[PDB]
């Protein structure tokens, strides 16, 4: 019965105005909800308490660019002048004392992406399989991805310029100084490695693509 329905994960320009929607189950239209913000690898943080009349109280460390409003069952989070640090999943919560027991429920969360952040384009380092691993009938290709900001990348491998998606393990991005790094491994047999002209590690970042290829062939 107690249900929170969060609006579609959205994408807002740096310095633009964002409005997220959390809608209450219709019978619970008078209820107070809480907004929460979960940035990567970090515990959720309390953002505010938001009442039926639009009155709110923001939590420890929340800037005055976060406000709220209400309309019937709709509970809204407004961010003006959205900043990169606002990039996160926004999660609403609601409590009630049902069947004489207290219960808290969470919305599914809304992924807020900030477009137009300042950008450092990824550096790729690619390694062939070692003579030693080849002797074991195996071939890991290594793509190391560094010097990038913000953290959102995708990684794709090509053999002879066509998609190879089987045997690929790709890491999530992690902090390195004021930037991010990620790794990708392509697992193949030594014959697949020897029988192709080229392999490509291709990384997409903020509308950009960087590709680094390597060949089994002598120079």
Q: Give the integer Cα–Cα distance in Å for 42 and 197.
A: 43
Strand (E) or helix (H) holding 201: strand 199-205
* Residue 103 binds to other proteins (criterion: CB under 8 A): yes
Dihedral over alpha carbons 186, 189, 195, 200 (to 10 degrees): 0
Kindly tell me the sign of the dihedral angle through the C-alpha atoms of 142, 145, 151, 153: negative
Binders of other proteins among 162-201, rule CB under 8 A? 169-171, 174, 176, 181-185
Write down the least CB distance from residue 86 to other proteins, Å. Answer: 18
Nearer to other proteins, 19 or 28 (CB): 28
37 contact partners, CB below 8 Å, separation of at least 6: 44, 45, 47, 86, 88, 89, 90, 91
* Residue 126 binds to other proteins (criterion: CB under 8 A): yes
* Residue 63 binds to other proteins (criterion: CB under 8 A): no
* Residue 97 binds to other proteins (criterion: CB under 8 A): yes
Where do runs of H (alpha helix) occur along the chain? 131-135, 190-195
* Residue 40 binds to other proteins (criterion: CB under 8 A): no
Write down the least CB distance from residue 202 to other proteins, Å. Answer: 17
Binding site for other proteins (CB under 8 A): 28, 30-34, 36, 38, 43-46, 49, 59-60, 91, 93-97, 101-109, 125-133, 140, 142, 144, 146, 169-171, 174, 176, 181-185, 214-216, 218-219
């Amino acid at each position: 019965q107690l249900v929170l329905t969060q609006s579609s994960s959205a994408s807002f320009s740096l310095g633009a105005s964002a409005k997220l929607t959390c809608t209450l189950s219709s019978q619970h239209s008078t209820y107070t909800i809480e907004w929460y913000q979960q940035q990567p690898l970090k515990p959720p943080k309390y953002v505010m308490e938001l009442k039926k009349d639009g009155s709110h109280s923001t939590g420890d460390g929340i800037p005055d660019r976060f406000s709220g409003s209400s309309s019937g069952a709709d509970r809204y989070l407004s961010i003006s002048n959205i900043q990169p640090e606002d990039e996160a999943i926004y999660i609403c919560g609601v409590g009630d004392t049902i069947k004489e027991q207290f219960v808290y429920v969470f919305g599914g969360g809304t992924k807020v992406t900030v477009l137009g952040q300042p950008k450092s384009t990824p550096t790729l380092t690619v390694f062939p399989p070692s003579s030693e691993e080849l002797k074991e009938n195996k071939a890991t290709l290594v793509c190391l991805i560094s010097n990038f900001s913000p953290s959102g990348v995708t990684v794709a491998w090509k053999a002879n310029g066509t998609p190879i998606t089987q045997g690929v393990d790709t890491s999530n991005p992690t902090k390195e100084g004021n930037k991010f790094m990620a790794s990708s491994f392509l697992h193949l047999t030594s014959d697949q490695w020897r029988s192709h002209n080229s392999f490509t590690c291709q990384v997409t970042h903020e509308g950009d693509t960087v590709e680094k290829s390597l060949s089994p062939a002598e120079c």
